[PDB]
């Protein structure tokens, strides 16, 4: 009794396959029956004969499993294809093909009475098709799986063919839920991991999953690892598995045509992982890894962010290193307002956008270590920083004190670390980190970092932030001495320069042309550098999900945002709360800023966001209104809050009430258009037209 | 429709006095009886004989008033003293003398039956002694005044001497409530204004009042006005009282040995005030003045602050103009952190503290107008700024939209003003303001500004801020071009410079020596300028109520804060709410700063504030627990929030958890000491000792 149907049990399953043998149903009937019984909570006695029919049904299901030649079926329908090493992502079978094949195996596996009649057979098929199209661990409430399924057609649930007593119905329904649960959690998942290697995509926008066939995955994995190894990794002998070093598993996550190398730290020790489950020390090691995170890795990460924040408060040069796209827009919006105040109108702009190739991979570790020590260049080796982790004090309702009248798992205990220990931890995470590679036979093939640091370790993210901010400070030190009329900002490896001064623009470009940045682990992607310099007319330039208009600097976010939105939201109240949060989060000040005449653009930005959520609600409304009860008045209150939020934030982020009355009518016109057809929105149209300031 | 007992009716009453005649009770008995009846709400008929006893009592009281030689009584007990023009503040009679004399006149005026028996006579005397110690109009709710007064002893309230019927008790209580109100609002106020001129003191820390005798007041008033007139004012003819100009009364507020000139705007029109009470238009004029503030002065004031905020966000020079002592401390702490970050240890500091003589009085209006126009130097004469006043939108729960389902006097309507109109309003408030002077006979004596602007007008406070910030921006423009290692900050007329660079330090002082700043309305107090420059050893320098220690920049607030604290708080819930706000507001980071070894100092600073509020609560507890009900658990909730606030703010304003466990125990030990005696605090001691992190 916890969650429901989740997909991470299917992710990242790699096994060499002998299709000649494969059995979908490996465990014994009694063990499978016990698992179904455990899920259903049923505890029958020794003399119960109800599940005799179920036991017979499984035997046929297993019987089809034994007499299925899976190798020919996969090759005949999906087909065996030669590996395409140039484009890794093309090797995956498309989700349309995946659906047609999983149904085929089930059709040969399950006889008609297993499906529970013809009518429920089609209903189950629709549910399976829905399941394959989940996404980022998108788990579905089980009660939607059973909705619409006729209990009568499942004649094997009990000895009687007629449901007569109150107890008879309850047992059949309870057992049926487990049987459906076993079909999806155990049978379907086993099938999915027996044909494909299921991996998450690298896109933070698209949460779709990629189904790489297992035989193709090994060829893809070997080619990319070998190519990556010769440029970033050094192979190590078998003797390195005998000491204490940080370690993690190496995985490949596709982009659009390439992979990204990541190293997920393991919850074990280097001396182990050979593997020996041992049943008991596997959890003690999990605590040992967890206790390492709680009072070593996390306090170091929190203190390092504390050290960086101290620099940010001091130097304006470090202030240019933001940490989100939202921060980038605000500085651009703030910089645009500076031009208007000082000049009246926005002058000509010289724009410079560039990025860094493989910032984590091409990183220079020896330089990083030197800058880490320069953070602590003043204090001695014995300083002893005392820190305690709380959710609101890293990079509200803060109840720290317990006492006997309030706040009565972990209890958050303070941690003390001194200067000498901290620096060695960084050295361990930079040089001593070891990655694991599995070959055809599954041997060691242990590798160590050659150039930079492994992605996915906790301190890796802050290490790049510390080093790159430091690089900007001294390489571009001319900018922050006798500063005048420029905007320089970086997120992680994406850099933007805006300035009306041509000569200063050349100086930054001169730095890019030179190899000065190559001293650090920064290498300029010369093939993806945009430029405006009074000769190319580019009114719109896209940087990081932002359409910034040249010569007015209005900022309009593109389609970089996504509604979650079906998963975890089935109630109207739950969906509304996310939608209200989602709308407010994405309705930022720069979109509503109307210092210029850009009010039509603001309406376009508001209209795109307002219509995205309202149309999303209607799409979910027709499917969840079947069982849930819709309260018209409460939805009206939700409409009032967001409309008020748009009005208040526009006024707050514009320093004037000019144009406020006109903004409200645009919101009202959108609402009436969307909600004029359905009769359930009869009150909504009447009420919305009265919204007045 | 009435609140309670208010004190502004007594402030600022000046009249030449002929004590030979004076009557405390000038109005007739019937009018006095009506005033009590109107306050009590009683509406007797023509044949009612209930109030016959009261009329007889007044005749004796008035008979004593005529048969009282008031001139000799003041001279024999308080005494007539020669005026001391050198020290103005010494002329006030101390409150100890004031209390002893007001009771004396009451004793000769009121016979025993007026006081309502022996038992109530002392109770009334205690209230009068309590009454004189008000403060900034800190007058007390009536229900506290009547509490404990025995109705039986007031035997003259009705013809019957025994209370028998339900109506008889109510009428006596209602009439007694009115009778008490007339004693304080009419008689006691008349006595206070017939012997002393009651004025607020100039200290923003101490809200104590000074009681200047009226006969001495005229001599003091004439001398200071004439000296001030010859340096800042031009007298005007009687013909100026015939047009529409802003106007206000002129009042003198002592400092330590001199006065500060203020001009309180009147709630009337210039064509009036001759004076003609007229009974009805005095309120129509009151609305007319109020409506001018709501949709003219305030929209101008809000928009003017908006323009300043635009400059503050843009220029670092304008950023130096903070608005509170809290901002000053934060900049010093931030600057101190900058010194540690860049140098390791805090280096030698060159400190410069100076102030401006008569900043508002010696202000230069013609220069002020030029900077006002430079605010609107870009836009044309027809811009039309739209503003709307909301409590959260000047220098949350913002429900702006009304609609037909929600939020259904004034309705807060938007105001539009153009460029030309706004500037003329500022000109009206600067040059056209006319002050009023009352002489011995009460004639015109009308004056207009010659040099600067009058204190106390709403736009005056922001006008100085606009000009002074503008003056800093260009006069010290060298500082904010090629900036390096300095801290410059001003509040209103107090300026501070801290820098380790000798060359930059001399340049600022060179400006002070020269007359460049004399172009504006700034005149440096050369006799009150502190300096540190490797030649003067000044470890401690006081700026604005802050003792900043040289060569470590630690900040320790002195006794500049005060609890309000009795006024507006009678409920336990109300008192707790102010105390929680007061503790959090005054517990600032610098008091909790433990960057140095000053951890014991932090505990003393925390202890001084913690004991200040807890002891204040106990003092109020014994008097308000009589009627209000004390909930121990709710008070514990108040204790938890402040203790949690101290812990979080100390950690936040120290970037470390060092000393946090010891700070909590210091708080715990203070609480047990304060609340160990009273039995009602039995739960408090048990709970506090369990307070743990």
Whole-number Cα distances in Å, B94 to B4, B90, B210: 27, 9, 8
Closest CA to A521 of A327, A370, A350: A370
CA distance linking residue B606 with residue B647, whole number of Å: 11
Nearest to A647 among B309, B387, B401 (CB): B401
Q: Is residue A4 part of a domain?
A: no
**A174 in the same domain as A77:** yes
Q: Which of residues 620-679 of A touch B (CB under 8 A)?
A: 633, 636-637, 640, 643-644, 647-648, 651-652, 655-658, 660, 664
Q: Residue B400: which of A314, A403, A693 has the nearest Cβ?
A: A693
Find tokens 């000798």 and name the residue. Answer: B502
| Dist CA A635 CA A641 (whole Å) | 10
Q: Is the peptide bond before B275 cis (omega within 30 degrees of 0)?
A: yes
Residue (of B350, B341, B687) closest to B541 by Cα position? B350
For A250, A585, A653, B81, B390, the CA distances from A579, given in Å and listed in that order, are 37, 10, 22, 77, 28
- Name the residue with tokens 């206070």: B192
Close Cβ partners of B322 (under 8 Å, ≥ 6 residues apart): B328, B331, B489, B490, B491
Give dist(CA A25, CA A194) in Å, integer: 11
In this structure, are residues A414 and A388 in contact, taking their beta carbons and an 8 Å threshold?
A: yes
The residues, ordered by sequence, that sit 6+ positions from B436 with a Cβ below 8 Å of its Cβ are: B247, B248, B249, B250, B266, B273, B444, B445, B446
Q: What gap in Å lies between CA B172 and CA A139, rounded to an integer?
A: 76
Residue of B nearest to A651 (CA): B393
Angstroms from A474 CA to nearest CA on chain B:
14
Report if residue B9 sits inside a domain: no
- Residues A256 and A89: beta-carbon distance below 8 Å: yes
- Angstrom distance (rounded) from CA B528 to CA B511: 17
Q: Do A125 and A100 meet the contact criterion of CB atoms below 8 Å apart?
A: no
Residues A467 and A514 in one domain: yes
**Nearest partner of A376 among B552, B337, B341, judged by Cα:** B341
User: What is the rounded CA–CA span in Å between residue A192 and residue B77?
Assistant: 105
Q: What angle do CA B571, B576, B582 make, to 5 degrees?
A: 130
Spell out the residues 6+ positions from residue A530 whose beta carbon is closer than 8 angstroms to its own. A351, A352, A353, A538, A541
For B231-253, b/e burial (b = at least 16 CB within 10 A) is ebbeeeeeebbeeebbbbbbbbb
A693 and B401 within 8 Å at the Cβ level: the answer is yes
- Give the closest-approach CA distance of B100 to chain A in angstroms: 51
* Contact present, A606 and A587 (Cβ < 8 Å): yes
Which residues on B lie below 8 Å from A632 (Cβ)? Answer: none
A240 neighbors A434 (Cβ within 8 angstroms): yes
Solved by what technique?
X-ray
Q: What are phi and psi of B346, to 5 degrees?
A: -75, 125
| DSSP H or E segment with residue B261 | strand B259-265
How does DSSP assign A110-144, residue by residue?
S-HHHHTHHHHHHHHHHHHHHHHT--SS--B-HHH
- CA-closest candidate to residue A668, choices A606, A618, A622: A606
- Mutate which: B401, B415, B649, B671, vs A, most A CBs within 10 A: B401
Neighbours of B308 (CB within 10 A): 19
A601, B31, B462, B504 from B518: Cα distances, Å: 49, 60, 20, 21
On the CB side of B387, CA atoms within 13 Å amount to 25
Specify the length of chain A in residues: 693
Q: What is d(CA B112, CA B296) in angstroms, rounded to the nearest whole number?
A: 56
Q: Three-state secondary structure along A421-490?
A: HHHHHHHHHHCCCEEECCCCCCCCCEEEECCCCCCCCHHHHHHHHHHHHHHHHHHCCCCCCCCCCCEEEE
Give me the residue label for tokens 């393991």. Answer: A266
In terms of phi and psi (left: phi > 0; alpha: psi -120 to 50; beta: otherwise), the region of A455 is: beta
Do the chains contact at A341 and B693, CB–CB below 8 Å?
no
Hey, is B571 helix, strand or coil?
coil
Residue A195 backbone dihedrals phi, psi, to 5 degrees: -130, -30
Residue A551: strand, helix, or coil: coil
Backbone angles phi, psi at A317, to 5 degrees: -65, -45
**Cα–Cα distances in angstroms (integers) from residue A176 to residues A40, A42, A51, B139, in the given order:** 8, 11, 11, 77
CB neighbours of residue B597 within 10 Å: 7
At what angle are helices A600-624 and A660-674 packed, to 10 degrees?
Answer: 30
In chain A, % helix, strand, coil (3-state, to 5) comes to 50, 10, 40
* CA neighbor of A376 nearest in space, from A328, A421, A435: A421
Specify if B225 maps to a domain: no
CB contact (8 A) between residue B647 and residue A386: no
Chain B residues with CB under 8 Å of A305 CB are none
CA dihedral B625, B626, B631, B637 (to 10 degrees): -20
Assess whether A122 and A90 both reside in one domain.
yes
* A614 and A531 both lie in a single domain: no
* Residue with token string 């050198």: B86
Query: By C-alpha distance, which of B504, B635, B513 is closest to B577?
Result: B635
**In sequence order, what are the beta bridge partners of A209?**
A200
Question: Do both A469 and A545 map to the same domain?
Answer: yes
For B433, other C-beta atoms within 10 Å of its C-beta total 21
Residues A566, A542 share a domain: no
Residue B230 forms part of a structural domain: no
Radius of gyration of chain B (CA): 30
DSSP-assigned beta bridge partners for residue B198: B11, B211
Nearest by Cα to A61 from A32, A95, A20, A97: A32
Q: Map residue B377 onto helix, strand or coil.
A: coil
Chain A contact present for B238, CB below 8 A: no
Let me know: does B38 contact B171? Beta carbons within 8 Å. no
Interface check for A47 against chain B (CB to CB < 8 A): the answer is: no
Distance CA A137, CA B8 (A): 69
For residue A163, how many other CB atoms are within 10 A of its CB?
15
Any domain includes B56: yes
Pairing label, strands A259-265, A247-254 = antiparallel
Return d(Cα A210, Cα A216) in angstroms, integer.
13
| Cα nearest neighbour of B402 on chain A | A692
Looking up tokens 């651009």 gives A332
Phi, psi of B558 (to 5 degrees): -90, -160
Q: Are the beta carbons of B385 and A658 separated by less than 8 Å?
A: yes
* Number of Cβ atoms within 10 Å of the Cβ of B592: 21
Minimum CA–CA partner of A401 in chain B: B693
> What single DSSP character describes residue A232?
H
Question: Which chain B residue shows the shortest CA-CA distance from A652?
Answer: B393
Residue of chain B with shortest Cα separation from A400: B693
Cross-chain residue pair B400–A647, CB shorter than 8 Å: yes
How is residue A600 written in tokens? 């039509």
Given a contact cutoff of 8 angstroms between Cβ atoms, the answer to whether A32 and A25 are in contact is: yes
* Structure tokens that stand for B364 in this block: 């230069």
SS3 A206: coil
Q: How far is B297 from chain A (nearest CA, A)?
A: 17
Hey, is A102 helix, strand or coil?
Answer: helix
Where is the domain boundary, A200, A234, A250? Answer: A200
* Residues whose CB falls within 8 Å of the CB of residue A674, separated by 6 or more in sequence, listed in order: A611, A614, A615, A618
Q: Is A556 helix (H, G, I), strand (E, B) or coil?
A: strand
For chain A, report the end-to-end CA distance as a whole number of angstroms.
50
> Do residues B571 and B666 both lie within one domain?
yes
Facing residues of B254 across strands?
B259
| Residue A322 near residue A521, CB atoms below 8 Å | no
The B residues from 395 to 434 touching A (CB cutoff 8 Å) are 398-406, 414
Q: Cα separation of A664 and A592, whole Å?
A: 13
Specify burial of residue A349 (Cβ count, 10 A radius: 0-12, 13-18, 19+).
buried
Q: Does B520 share its domain with B613?
A: no
Our measurement of the distance from residue A324's CA atom to the centroid of its chain's CA atoms, rounded to an integer in Å, reads: 15
Nearest to B173 by CA among B147, B197, B198: B147
- Inter-chain touch B655–A342, beta carbons under 8 Å: no
Cα separation, A142 vs A124, whole angstroms: 13
Question: Is there a domain that residue A208 lies in?
Answer: no
In DSSP notation, B414-452 reads -EEE-HHHHHHHHHHHHTS-EEE---SS----EEEESSS
Domain end marker among B546, B571, B604: B546
Using the structure block, give the residue that is written with the tokens 């009248």: A405
Question: How many angstroms separate the CA atoms of A114 and A121, rounded?
Answer: 9
- Structural domains in chain A (count): 3
Determine how many CB atoms are found less than 10 A away from the CB of residue B577: 13
CA angle B215, B217, B219 (to 5 degrees): 85
- Rounded CA gap, A638 and A657, in Å? 24
What is the rounded distance in angstroms from the CA atom of residue A195 to the CA atom of residue B305? 69
Q: What is the spatial distance between Cα A109 and Cα A194, in angstroms, rounded to a whole number?
A: 15
CA distance A594 to A659: 9
DSSP class of residue A184 equals: I
What six digits make up the tokens of A191?
């099938």
Pairing of strands B247-254, A446-449: unpaired
d(CA A613, CA B652): 38
Q: What share of chain B is helix, strand, coil (3-state, %, to 5)?
A: 50, 10, 40
Question: A266 in a domain, yes or no?
Answer: no
Q: Are A351 and A497 contacting, i.e. CB atoms less than 8 angstroms apart?
A: yes
* Of A195, A165, A172, nearest in space to A40 by CA: A172
Q: Which of B310, B633, B687 sits opposite A404 (nearest CB)?
A: B687
Query: What residues 461-500 of chain A have any CB closer than 8 A to a CB of chain B?
Result: 481-482
- Cβ–Cβ under 8 Å, residues A363 and A467: yes
3-state secondary structure of B640: helix
Nearest Cβ partner of B406 from A377, A405, A640?
A640
Distance from CA of A24 to the nearest CA of B (A): 54
φ/ψ bin of A505: left (φ > 0), alpha (ψ from -120 to 50), beta (otherwise): alpha
- CB of A445 closer than 8 Å to CB of A439: yes
CA A178 → CA A107, A122, A129, A130, B392, distances in Å? 20, 19, 20, 19, 56
Q: Which residues of B touch A648 (CB under 8 A)?
A: 398, 400
Of the CA atoms within 13 Å of residue A247, those in its CB half-sphere come to 19
Identify the three-state secondary structure at position B263: strand
Alpha helices in A543-631 (DSSP H): 572-586, 589-592, 600-624
CB contact under 8 A, B310 and A341: yes
Q: What is the number of CB-based contacts under 8 A between chain A and chain B? A: 126
Q: By CA distance, what is B633's nearest residue in A?
A: A405
- Those of residues 527-566 in B touching chain A at CB distance below 8 A are none
Q: Rounded to the nearest 10 degrees, what angle do helices A458-475 and A365-375 cross at? A: 80
How far is Cα A265 from Cα B432, in angstroms, rounded to an integer?
76
User: Which SS3 state, helix, strand or coil, does residue A632 take?
Assistant: helix
Q: Rounded to the nearest 5 degrees, what angle is found at the Cα of B174, between the Cα atoms of B170 and B176?
A: 115
Q: How far apart are CA A423 and CA A335, in angstroms?
A: 38
Query: What resolution in angstrom units was achieved for this structure?
Result: 3.5
CA distance A665 to chain B (A): 12
Q: Which burial class, exposed, middle or buried, applies to A213 when counting CB atoms under 10 A from its CB (0-12, 13-18, 19+)?
A: buried
Task: Give yes or no: residues A84 and A181 share one domain.
Answer: yes
**Angle of the B458-475 helix axis to the B298-314 helix axis, nearest 10:** 20
Tell me, yes or no, whether B450 and B573 share the same domain.
Answer: no
- Which of A655, A687, A688 to mutate against chain B (most B CBs within 10 Å)? A655
Residue A411 tokens read as 């209890």
Tell me the backbone φ, ψ of residue A233, rounded to 5 degrees: -135, 155
**Hey, are the CB atoms on B405 and A687 less than 8 Å from each other?**
yes
B586/B604 Cα distance (integer angstroms): 14
Question: Is position B273 within any domain?
Answer: no
Discontinuities in chain B with C to N beyond 2.5 Å fall right after 20, 395, 408
Q: For tokens 């606030």, what's the residue?
A: B645
Per residue, the 3-state secondary structure of A253-308, as one string, reads EECCCCEEEEEEECCCCCCCCCCCCCCCHHHHHHHHHHHHHHHHHHHHHHHHHHHH
Question: Which residues are CB-contacts of B27 (< 8 A; sequence separation ≥ 6)?
Answer: B35
Other Cβ atoms closer than 10 A to B389: 15
Q: Does B334 touch chain A if contact means CB atoms closer than 8 Å?
A: yes
B404/A647 CB distance under 8 A: no
User: Do residues B224 and B252 lie in contact, with contact meaning Cβ atoms separated by under 8 Å?
Assistant: yes
Q: Based on the domain organization, do B364 and B510 belong to the same domain? A: yes
**Nearest CA-CA distance, residue A400 and chain B, Å:** 6
Domain extent for B518: 292-403+410-546
- Alpha carbons B410 and B405: distance in angstroms, whole number: 19
B-contacting residues in A 361-380 (Cβ below 8 Å): 377-378
Q: Pull the structure tokens for residue A425.
A: 């931890």
| Tokens matching residue B538 | 């000044």
Q: Could you say which of B182, B199, B216 is where a domain stops?
A: B199
- Count, residues in chain B: 693
Q: Do A315 and A336 sit in the same domain of this protein?
A: yes
> What's A142's domain CATH number?
1.10.132.70
Could you give the CA distance from residue B466 to residue B321 in angstroms, rounded to a whole number?
10
As to burial, measured by CB atoms within 10 angstroms (0-12 exposed, 13-18 middle, 19+ buried), residue B164 is exposed
Write the CB contacts of B448 (distance below 8 Å, at least 6 apart in sequence): B233, B234, B236, B240, B431, B432, B433, B434, B435
A691:B401 CB<8 A:
yes
Report the gap between the CA of B564 and the closest CA in chain A (Å). 28
Residue written as tokens 């503290």?
A: B353
User: Which residue in A400, A636, A648 is closest to B400 by CB distance?
Assistant: A648
Q: Which residues of B447-485 are buried (b: 16+ CB within 10 A; e: fewer)?
A: bbbebbbbbbbebbebbbbbbbbbbbbebbeebbeeeee
Rounded distance between C-alpha atoms, residue B180 and residue B124, angstroms: 9
SS3 A352: strand
Give the helix ranges, DSSP H, for A268-418: 281-292, 298-314, 316-319, 325-343, 365-375
């Amino acid at each position: 009794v916890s969650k429901y149907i989740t997909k991470f049990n299917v992710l990242y399953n790699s096994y060499s396959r002998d299709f000649s043998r494969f059995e979908m149903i490996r465990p014994s009937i009694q063990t499978i029956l016990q698992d179904i019984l455990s899920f259903s909570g049923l505890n029958p006695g020794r003399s119960s004969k109800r599940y005799r029919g179920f036991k017979s049904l499984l035997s046929r299901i297993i019987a089809n499993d034994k007499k299925c030649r899976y190798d020919i079926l996969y090759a005949k329908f999906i087909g065996t294809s030669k590996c395409n090493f140039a484009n890794v992502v093309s090797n995956k079978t498309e989700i349309s093909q995946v659906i047609q094949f999983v149904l085929l195996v089930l059709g040969k596996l399950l006889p008609l009475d297993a499906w529970g009649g013809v009518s429920n057979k089609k209903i189950i098929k629709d549910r399976v098709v829905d399941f394959l199209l989940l996404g980022a661990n998108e788990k579905i409430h089980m009660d939607d799986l059973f909705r619409g399924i006729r209990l009568k057609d499942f004649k094997w649930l009990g000895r009687a063919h007629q449901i007569s007593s109150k107890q008879d119905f309850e047992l059949r329904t309870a057992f049926l839920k487990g049987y459906l649960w076993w079909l999806f959690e155990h049978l379907l998942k086993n099938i999915l991991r027996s044909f494909w290697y299921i991996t998450e995509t690298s896109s933070i926008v698209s949460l779709e999953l990629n189904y790489f066939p297992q035989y193709l995955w090994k060829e893809l994995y070997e080619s990319w690892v070998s190519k990556y190894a010769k440029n970033n990794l050094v192979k190590m002998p078998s003797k390195i598995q005998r000491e204490q070093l940080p370690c993690g598993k190496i995985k490949l996550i596709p982009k659009r045509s390439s992979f990204r190398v990541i190293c997920v730290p393991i919850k074990r020790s280097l001396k182990l992982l050979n593997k020996k489950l041992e049943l008991d020390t596997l959890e003690k090691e999990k605590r040992e890894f967890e206790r390492y995170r709680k009072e070593v890795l996390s306090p170091v990460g929190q203190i390092l962010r504390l050290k960086l924040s101290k620099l940010r408060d001091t130097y304006e040069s470090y202030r240019a290193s933001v940490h989100s796209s939202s921060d980038v827009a605000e500085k651009i919006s703030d910089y645009r307002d500076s031009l208007l105040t000082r000049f009246g109108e926005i002058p000509k702009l010289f724009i410079l956008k560039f990025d860094m190739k493989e910032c984590y991979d091409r990183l220079s570790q020896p330089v990083l270590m030197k800058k880490l020590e320069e953070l602590f260049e003043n204090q001695d080796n014995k300083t002893s920083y005392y820190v305690r982790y709380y959710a609101q004090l890293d990079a509200h309702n803060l109840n720290i004190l317990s006492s006997s009248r309030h706040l009565s798992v972990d209890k958050t205990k303070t941690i003390a670390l001194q200067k000498g220990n901290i620096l060695e931890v960084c050295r361990s995470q930079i040089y001593d980190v070891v990655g694991s590679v599995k070959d055809a036979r599954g041997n060691l093939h242990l590798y160590k970092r050659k150039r930079g640091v492994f992605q996915g370790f906790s301190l890796s993210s802050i290490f790049c932030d510390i080093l790159y901010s430091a690089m900007v400070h001294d390489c571009f030190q001319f900018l922050w001495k006798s500063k005048q009329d420029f905007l320089f900002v970086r997120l992680v490896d994406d850099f933007l320069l805006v300035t009306p001064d041509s000569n200063i623009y050349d100086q930054v470009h001169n730095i890019l042309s030179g190899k000065i940045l190559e001293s650090y682990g920064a290498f300029v992607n010369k093939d993806k550098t945009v430029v405006v310099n009074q000769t190319t007319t580019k009114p719109s330039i896209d940087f990081v999900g932002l359409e910034v208009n040249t010569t007015d600097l209005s900022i309009k976010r593109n389609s970089g945002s996504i509604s979650l939105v079906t998963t975890n939201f089935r109630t109207f109240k739950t969906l509304v709360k996310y939608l209200k949060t989602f709308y407010q989060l994405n309705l930022e000040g720069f979109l509503l800023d109307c210092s210029f005449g850009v009010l039509e653009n603001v309406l376009e930005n508001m209209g795109s966001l307002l219509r995205l959520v309202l149309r999303e609600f209607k799409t979910k409304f027709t499917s969840i209104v079947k069982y849930d009860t819709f309260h018209c008045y409460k939805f009206i209150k939700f409409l009032y809050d967001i409309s008020n939020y748009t009005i208040v934030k526009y006024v707050e982020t514009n320093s004037d009430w000019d144009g406020a009355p006109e903004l409200l009518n645009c919101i009202k016109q959108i609402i009436v258009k969307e909600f004029s057809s359905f009769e359930s929105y009869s009150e909504i149209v009447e009420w919305v037209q009265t919204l007045n300031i």
